[PDB]
RNA sequence: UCUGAGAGUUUGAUCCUGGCUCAGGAUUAACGCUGGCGGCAUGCCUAAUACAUGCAAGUCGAUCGAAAGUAGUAAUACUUUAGAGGCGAACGGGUGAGUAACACGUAUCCAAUCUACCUUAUAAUGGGGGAUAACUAGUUGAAAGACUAGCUAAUACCGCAUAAGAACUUUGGUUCGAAUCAAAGUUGAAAGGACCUGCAAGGGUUCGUUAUUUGAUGAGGGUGCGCCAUAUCAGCUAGUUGGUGGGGUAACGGCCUACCAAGGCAAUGACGUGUAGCUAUGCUGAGAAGUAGAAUAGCCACAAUGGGACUGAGACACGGCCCAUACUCCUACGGGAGGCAGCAGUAGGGAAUUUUUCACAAUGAGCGAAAGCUUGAUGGAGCAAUGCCGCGUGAACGAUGAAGGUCUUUAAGAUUGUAAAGUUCUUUUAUUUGGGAAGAAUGACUUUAGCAGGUAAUGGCUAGAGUUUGACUGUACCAUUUUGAAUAAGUGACGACUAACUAUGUGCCAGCAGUCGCGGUAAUACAUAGGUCGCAAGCGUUAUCCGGAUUU
């Protein structure tokens, strides 16, 4: 195979609405150019007629697509297609030895590239900023370099000057290389380089001084050379940019287009120049859940670790699980050990699904990605081993899809199908969580954004072939009540097993947050002890159910009042049933009240929709006594009802471009307002 | 799939061409005998049939029966 | 049950003393009938040929301590050899490894004998049995392994070994030879296997 | 071999050019275990001669068992 | 004779007529409940539906030219054959759609039939001519593919020499629809590659072919006997029916046809109809008989359905070919493609029917002097108590059995129960130690003694001696290898049929239930606490055939 230095992974490190998947498909076709099948004229050009971006995000989603490009192996992985979430972008980041950040110039108002950049900046992985929106009505180059700063502020040093910047991008002026144009719209194969002429020698020279004034600080002999007027050598410039991407000092902001499809040649050139081997890249950390949560490296060496970062379903050939090889060689043809399951599993064949093929293979070296065809028991984060390396079970690097939407139960077949559907979606995301309301025998779906929910439903309905009614979210709706009166109970018999009689008086006492407590007032022998231990049997069982719809009857006190005395019989469990029915009737007639969560919101919104979110919460009738200040965001300490919480993230985002975000802390249960409680009383 | 199946396919298609030629030669010798009925053509048919039976394509029973039917016509003349 | 955990119950209720004065024994309470709140002469027709066939089968397969599946296996294995079902079946059942080890006087109880022989310390046909499933034949030498020549309970049992007109045991060397089958006169007096013979109607 | 694992039982049969073991046979050669070095096969210096003189030589794994009986020492000169 | 269960069902009661049920082995099982191991064997009945994926017979130079390079200047020592050509390719396995019949069981007619290697061995490997791939060039080409142009080898294509024997003409002889032999006509066998000795010839030496020829091998048509249903199907059948001649698969056969024809089967129900794969093997019962011939051994059938041809000895060929019909990938819409009723495995119905299985270790073939290779056949293994099999959840002493469930309801007691407090002891399954496999220790390969055509020459038969070979398995078995009572329990129901029941709610409500039938003014059949017996790592359940019903 290709050398270990040449095993570099690259995940599409961006979000949709940015021309993301168009660029991903363009890169996949550019590095996967094969002519013996006629593909060169089958995927020649890629561009949008965009009225829907979910199709672009889903159909082009490359879970693991490996190809080779003359010097190296390019592992293009377009797992993210959601606008804002963590699992797909995070697995792409973990896999990739270098990152490509797809940014915009026509729409610089995209809100969900800051968190993506922050995720990629955790491991210091090399990043190349590439902009493809420079082919519309309203794009620019100054817009690119200003949006890359106001959104992020990473000092993106422009090594590429776009010849064509609004709707005519067809050339690039380079510093490490020479100026280049693009005569080939759509499919690109040639970088039409041109020299530095007299009309542009100063144009390139000013930015050369710009770049060497930064590069001079590194390797201070360069600073001295600048004293003596010696321009920094291009090799030193390249090494310093490599350090500034793997060390996050400064990154080049390239330029390109995705609708005339210009600017992918020097894109890949700079990717190769600055995104190095899986040993030069700062390796991502792995805290194995099996007790070895320590800082470890991912350098290429003898020990082998195999992490299944993606899965897919197929009945005929078996499950197709995409794995990333971080170190060593993955053995096959025998029993492979799963440390997470801590057992050896018998495997038959292994595979790799490239951009256009499923090659049946057995081994992929570190820095690259592989797959197993079959292996119906695998999870995202597991470690397949053969040399008995340490554990790397990763589950903390991913976060929760927060904001709930209820799902109601129906006939057996669909619910049984969605059982395995959710279970197998939990191995596609180790933090994909779901709730189960007491009012439903089914799950509660979780998402925050419109696109995240749509793509989760798409994964539910495409890979698993199942769809449901996503109902309005509901509450556990706990049950208390207010002052209620005395009730009475009797049981009389003469036939049957034997005659048994009981006659008791009981009252059901309210509380708010104090649970079951007993208040007894029986003194005088009006009910003997033989009929005393019976009646209490009917008390506690009254706390286990609600009279409206089975809601939990918690935080409620029950009080025994009186019984009855008799000589010729009137035995015990007659008193038991009398007390039980007395408690039940008192619970019936209590006219209860309910409890729901009204949560204090820690609203962390950037200071462009602070007023918009302020007005939104005022419409939601919150308690905004003030607002604490932060770096670029304001945090409102407010209150929001759970009813207005349903879609709160979605509505706030629809009113604020999606940058207005949400931080939600769970609060103690409080009395339901008069409007909410009376719709449930029955 | 067995590669030897296609190997014997190659061999048997070439045998198809060769045996078509040889059986057509034998049948045209038989036709010549049936046109000019004489002992010389009977001997030519005998030689051709002996050659084909020696080659081992079809069993000698067919050769013997065809030449017996030919010499029956010989006795009819 | 192929087992117990209070044998004295089985001995008393079955009407046959599995131990003569060590299982129907005055150890506090002592019984000879069905115990509990249902000790009663059932006026319902609980008595027939079926009932006493069952009862004799219970007595015989509970004095041995063996499972009923091996009872049926022994029946089937004897069916390979022509003869008389009753005497041959009872003699083969008596020839059980655990039953013969107890008959040697090597264990105070059939359950204890079964546990000991299973423990991997009984040599028969030069094979230390890890499962007491080897049916003996006249002259089969059962040997006590080097382990069970130092065990106090079975030491005391062996030193009090039992000899019968159809077996013998050398207790000092912890060995036993099954001399012969109990043919028709060395069988227990209150036990009759003929009922199990008549218990089938598919012969 | 066949039967139960670690207790193999080899049933030796005849063949001409295509048939398997213990299926369609001209005549059952006999029974040898791969773990047993002595055969209780139907070998009596006569059936082997019958199989050799009738053509369709049987399975080629009891040749040593026929060699011990001197089958070849007479057949290689009978054919000669 | 091995051998054979009863009871319950009617009128006030009695009996009779008749019927039903449980009472039995047994699972492709499943199923509740839980669960010890391993051995062991089982494992889509339904779906013959597409089959994705790997796989389901490979071996060949001791047949050849060159390809093709390691060392060599090259020749060449050397690697196999892309290709020509050889065998096996029809093996194997699969299911049984369909097939009810010579397929079968059996003796056969084969007078009509071949069978490659093999086999009984007589005859041969004399001599060539010229191609053809390989090689080379061009062409169409995204590839798929694809045409043209030439050269050359052989074991390659095509004649002849000899050619016993033999095919086959005419005469005689012999013989139960021909057996047998004499005379005599015609007529044809290629092809040599390779190793030691020998100048060569020749001898030894290994392959490839040749005829002749005893059989096997697979099978051909018929074949008496028996071979599912089919009257709430009575007429059916125009090669129908047979003959002369001619042609014909391997051949007799209207196999088929020209000619000549009107008959053939049939109330013992013809024809038609759809089905089952047939025998051995699979259970029940004493028996009568019933229950499958799934898968399997033999035979038989498709091998996605229906044809055609070729090869091969045998195919009109699952995994050859061409095609029509079902399907399909990619694509520039020009184009090319194939079959798990092979193994698995997938999709489904179902209760479920195994690995998307490992080595050919041993066994089969095939072929190669030989090293050997592949088998998804085989041998293993997984797999689900999947079924069977055995195992252990203690024992001993110790009380009037201390706790308590049920009864009593006082109130011990007594059931559980020597279960316990109390004292110890035992360890397969709990648990570790090392020995650690048998199975290669087979075919094959190599030294040799004898034999041995030769032994001038290398080699071959028997054997001495060695080579080497695991799917398993640090498995199996051994030894308290060490501490320990510790490591495992559930089910039915207790009114009878047919063992296991006392009380509590319950007024024919609750709910039980295979038959009788259970509960409407105090429930041992219900529900439960409990005790109880039958069992048991399996327990109960239905499923399925006969006998218990002679009660067809």
* Oligomeric grouping of the chains: part of a larger assembly
Provide the number of structural domains of chain D. 1
Contiguous helical run count of chain D? 3
Estimated helix fraction of chain A: 25-40%
Shape of chain A, please? elongated
Lay out the secondary structure.
This is part of a larger assembly, with chains A (682 residues), B (77 residues), C (203 residues) and D (80 residues).
Chain A: E1 7-12, H1 20-31, H2 54-59, E2 65-69, E3 72-77, H3 87-95, E4 98-103, H4 114-120, E5 127-131, H5 142-150, E6 160-163, E7 171-174, E8 179-181, E9 192-194, H6 198-215, H7 221-227, H8 234-246, H9 265-274, E10 305-312, E11 320-327, E12 335-338, E13 343-346, E14 349-353, E15 358-361, E16 368-373, E17 384-385, E18 404-406, H10 412-425, E19 444-446, H11 450-462, E20 478-480, E21 486-491, E22 502-509, E23 518-520, H12 532-540, E24 557-562, H13 572-588, E25 593-606, H14 610-619, E26 627-629, E27 633-641, H15 642-645, H16 648-655, E28 669-671, H17 674-678
Parallel strand pairs in A: 1-3, 1-4, 4-5, 23-24
Antiparallel strand pairs in A: 2-3, 6-7, 7-8, 8-9, 10-11, 11-16, 12-13, 12-17, 14-15, 14-16, 18-19, 20-25, 21-22, 22-24, 25-27, 25-28, 26-27
Chain B: H1 3-35, H2 39-55, H3 60-76
Helix pairs in contact in B: 1-2, 2-3
Chain C: H1 7-13, H2 49-63, H3 68-79, H4 85-94, H5 97-103, H6 110-118, E1 122-124, E2 127-128, E3 141-144, H7 152-159, E4 168-170, E5 175-177, H8 194-198
Antiparallel strand pairs in C: 1-2, 1-3, 3-5, 4-5
Helix pairs in contact in C: 3-4, 5-6
The structure holds one RNA strand of 552 nucleotides.
PDB class: translation
Keywords: In-cell cryo-electron tomography, sub-tomogram analysis, ribosome, translation intermediate state, pseudouridimycin, translation
Entry title: 70S ribosome with EF-G, A*- and P/E-site tRNAs in pseudouridimycin-treated Mycoplasma pneumoniae cells
